[PDB]
Amino acid sequence: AVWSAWRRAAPAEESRGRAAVVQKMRACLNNGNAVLNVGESGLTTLPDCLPAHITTLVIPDNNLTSLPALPPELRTLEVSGNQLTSLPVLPPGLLELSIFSNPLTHLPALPSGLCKLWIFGNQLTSLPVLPPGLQELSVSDNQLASLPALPSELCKLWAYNNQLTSLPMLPSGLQELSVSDNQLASLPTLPSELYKLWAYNNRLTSLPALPSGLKELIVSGNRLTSLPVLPSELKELMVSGNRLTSLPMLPSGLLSLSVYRNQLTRLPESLIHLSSETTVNLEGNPLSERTLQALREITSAPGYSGPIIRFDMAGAETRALHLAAADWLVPADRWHMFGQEDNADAFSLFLDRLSETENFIKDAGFKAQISSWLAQLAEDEALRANTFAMATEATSSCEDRVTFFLHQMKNVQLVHNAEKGQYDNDLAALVATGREMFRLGKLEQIAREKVRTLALVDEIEVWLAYQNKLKKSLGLTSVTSEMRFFDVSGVTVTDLQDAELQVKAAEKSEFREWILQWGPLHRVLERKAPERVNALREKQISDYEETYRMLSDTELRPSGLVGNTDAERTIGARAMESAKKTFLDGLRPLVEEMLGSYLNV
């Protein structure tokens, strides 16, 4: 009767959904079922009475603006995405309150027996007084400037991505503290049972004494000038992006050590005693010469059984893009407008860094080659966008990382040119670019393989060393002449000799088939022979479907297996490969006609 009035007040598209909710409510009233879940039905209103014995009420994603008075025996309320801007009075016996993804800015009075308060992801600007027996407070992704006094019984406090500048005193049994992405200038004294402390991206300059049983400490992106003694059971130490000048003794059981972008000049000796599975990232620290020497000595020894150690040579401002660009261009107007395009800063920073590289120092031609490239960039908005985006690193590291990213930008440019049509009437240029891409791809795999063999590694130096040292012998036109830190790459003369041999052997064996799968070649074929290539693509699709069905009929059906999602994955995969191989068969003659006279040495 209240429910009938409600069901009939329905916008027409909600009429069936409202009938479904009335059916559920009737079910509660008629069988004593004390759980009501109103479903996802695009509800814009709920009826004014809900069944009165309901103890769990679940409100999924709907378009609700208001909730009715709540069933007096309610123990659990759970509300998903809606447009609630407030909540009704909460029933005295409520135990758990969840609300997610509502524009809600404030909560009503909280019942004294509440135990779980899961109110993350709303718009809350304040909290009510918290009941003393509250056990979990989850209030991340809101708009809170502060938290109220914390109940004595709390075990978990999550409040990351708010605007907190301090925390209240912490309850003695707190086990979990997760308050990252705030503006905390400090932490208060840390409770004894705390096993997890996540406070990344705050404004901490020191840490309180650490609890004996602390297992995780993640405080990267702070302003820490030191860490206190680490407790012996710590497993995770993530303190990157701070101002640390040294580290404490490292607990033997540490499973991750992330200390990149600090100011470390020395390493604890305990680092070498860490387990062989522990992850270690030391990049972007001014490690002394001897420190790095001693490291190479220890990790290179036979029988070394410590961690794999990632390092670099970076050690421990953004002009207007047009200023950065004017420094390179031969006689920049255009670069004013480019300054406002997406990632333009990243690229501005990149260009400033490029003037401090070994190529700049040693190759008098370098300014002019960068100028030609900047000029090509100015005429191609697509390329320019991709290039600017790529600058997002190289700025993360040393001179060689910048140089490496220059090589990657130049690779992008060659593929782009091929894809666009620059070489449709210069097919020897098209084939040359293909060979260069084939060789670079092979170097990437060779460098990845060499990286796996190294216990002390700078993976970018490794990959760069191969590009740089094989530029001449492999005709890598997109690669520059100079690099600074080859001595620390770990790449030997024998390594380079073997990579030359492997790539030349592979190209001889694989290239003619490899170029059939090369994407820019497809772009060129589709331009020169649009009807034949479209026909081949349409056939590739049909062949898959027809081959699927035949494999299903001939192999799955007699088993098995026609419902079986695993067997159907196996034949689907087989039908793609089959159809692919047929597709490349129809491409091959087309490539042979267009390119055969270009594919001799």
3-class SS letters over 92-109: CCCCEEEECCCCCCCCCC
- The phi and psi torsions of 505 (rounded to 5 degrees) equal -65, -50
280 forms bridges with which residues in the sheet? 257, 309
What is the DSSP-derived secondary structure letter of residue 45? -
Residues 6+ apart with CB under 8 A from 9: 45
258 forms bridges with which residues in the sheet? 238, 281
Residue 235 has, within 13 A of its CA and on its CB side, a CA count of 6
Burial of 151-190, coded b for 16+ CB within 10 Å and e otherwise, reads bebbebbbbbbbebeebeebbeebbbbbbbbbebeebeeb
> Do 160 and 183 form a contact (C-beta atoms < 8 A)?
no
Count each helix (H run) and each strand (E run) in the chain, helices first.
16, 15
User: Encoding tokens for residue 297?
Assistant: 């000595």
> Do 124 and 103 form a contact (C-beta atoms < 8 A)?
no
User: Encoding tokens for residue 127?
Assistant: 């909290």
Provide the 10 A C-beta neighbour count for residue 107. Answer: 19
Which amino acid is it at 460?
I
Which amino acid is it at 554?
T
Which position has the token pair 């107007």? 333
Instruction: Compute the distance between CA of residue 400 and CA of residue 54 in angstroms, rounded to an integer.
Output: 66
Instruction: Compute the distance between CA of residue 198 and CA of residue 305 in angstroms, rounded to an integer.
Output: 30
Residues 6+ apart with CB under 8 A from 28: 34, 35, 36, 51, 53, 54
Cis before 561? omega within 30: yes
Vertex 543, ends 538 and 548: CA angle to 5°? 135
Vertex 38, ends 36 and 44: CA angle to 5°? 145
Q: 3-state SS of 463-480?
A: HHHHHHHCCCCCCCCCCC
Angle between helices 366-378 and 381-390 (to 10 degrees): 120
Cα 413 from chain centre: 25
How do beta strands 96-99 and 116-118 pair? parallel
- The phi and psi torsions of 517 (rounded to 5 degrees) equal -95, 0
Instruction: Compute the distance between CA of residue 263 and CA of residue 256 in angstroms, rounded to an integer.
Output: 19
What is the DSSP-derived secondary structure letter of residue 291? H
Q: Which ranges of 421-492 does DSSP label H, i.e. alpha helix?
A: 427-452, 459-469
Q: What one-character-per-residue DSSP string does 209-251 give?
A: PPPTT--EEE--SS--S---PPPTT--EEE--SS--S--PPPP
Which amino acid is it at 399?
E
Instruction: Compute the distance between CA of residue 436 and CA of residue 93 in angstroms, rounded to an integer.
Output: 72
Provide the 10 A C-beta neighbour count for residue 340. Answer: 8
Vertex 578, ends 574 and 583: CA angle to 5°? 145
Pick the closest to residue 499 from 528, 524, 463 (CA basis).
463
Give the containing element (helix H, strand E) for 279: strand 279-281
Instruction: Compute the distance between CA of residue 290 and CA of residue 297 in angstroms, rounded to an integer.
Output: 10
Instruction: Compute the distance between CA of residue 333 and CA of residue 338 in angstroms, rounded to an integer.
Output: 9
> Do 230 and 210 form a contact (C-beta atoms < 8 A)?
yes
> How distant, in Å, are the alpha carbons of 42, 45, 82, 118, 151 from that of 62?
5, 9, 5, 19, 33
| Polymer length of the chain | 601
Vertex 392, ends 480 and 409: CA angle to 5°? 30
What is the Cα gyration radius of the chain? Answer: 32
Instruction: Compute the distance between CA of residue 123 and CA of residue 493 in angstroms, rounded to an integer.
Output: 61
> How distant, in Å, are the alpha carbons of 192, 283, 289, 356, 581 from that of 315?
37, 8, 11, 15, 50
Q: Which ranges of 64-183 does DSSP label H, i.e. alpha helix?
A: none
Q: What is the dihedral of CA 30, 32, 37, 42, to 10 degrees?
A: 20
Give the containing element (helix H, strand E) for 25: helix 15-31
Q: Is the CATH number of domain 1-316 3.40.50.970?
A: no
Q: Which ranges of 453-560 does DSSP label H, i.e. alpha helix?
A: 459-469, 493-514, 519-528, 530-551
36 forms bridges with which residues in the sheet? 57
> How distant, in Å, are the alpha carbons of 436, 445, 476, 481, 498 from that of 502?
15, 11, 16, 22, 6
> How distant, in Å, are the alpha carbons of 188, 206, 220, 401 from that of 228?
14, 8, 15, 33
Which position has the token pair 């001897």? 290
Instruction: Compute the distance between CA of residue 3 and CA of residue 20 in angstroms, rounded to an integer.
Output: 11
Instruction: Compute the distance between CA of residue 274 and CA of residue 229 in angstroms, rounded to an integer.
Output: 17
Q: Is 398 a catalytic residue?
A: yes
Pick the closest to residue 394 from 435, 441, 440, 347 (CA basis).
347
> Do 7 and 1 form a contact (C-beta atoms < 8 A)?
no
Provide the 10 A C-beta neighbour count for residue 261. Answer: 21
Instruction: Compute the distance between CA of residue 131 and CA of residue 98 in angstroms, rounded to an integer.
Output: 15
Cα 338 from chain centre: 27
Instruction: Compute the distance between CA of residue 319 and CA of residue 323 in angstroms, rounded to an integer.
Output: 6
> How distant, in Å, are the alpha carbons of 92, 215, 505 from that of 249?
52, 16, 50
Q: Where are the domains of the chain?
A: 1-316, 317-601
Vertex 254, ends 232 and 490: CA angle to 5°? 145
Pick the closest to residue 577 from 529, 517, 520 (CA basis).
517
Catalytic residue among 49, 115, 155, 398: 398
Instruction: Compute the distance between CA of residue 134 and CA of residue 137 in angstroms, rounded to an integer.
Output: 7
Instruction: Compute the distance between CA of residue 114 and CA of residue 103 in angstroms, rounded to an integer.
Output: 22
Which amino acid is it at 262?
N
Which position has the token pair 């992801």? 121
**197 by DSSP, 3-state: which?**
strand
> Do 409 and 419 form a contact (C-beta atoms < 8 A)?
no
**398 by DSSP, 3-state: which?**
coil
Residue 332 has, within 13 A of its CA and on its CB side, a CA count of 13
Q: What is the dihedral of CA 315, 319, 322, 323, to 10 degrees?
A: -80
Handedness of CA 542, 543, 544, 547 (dihedral sign): positive
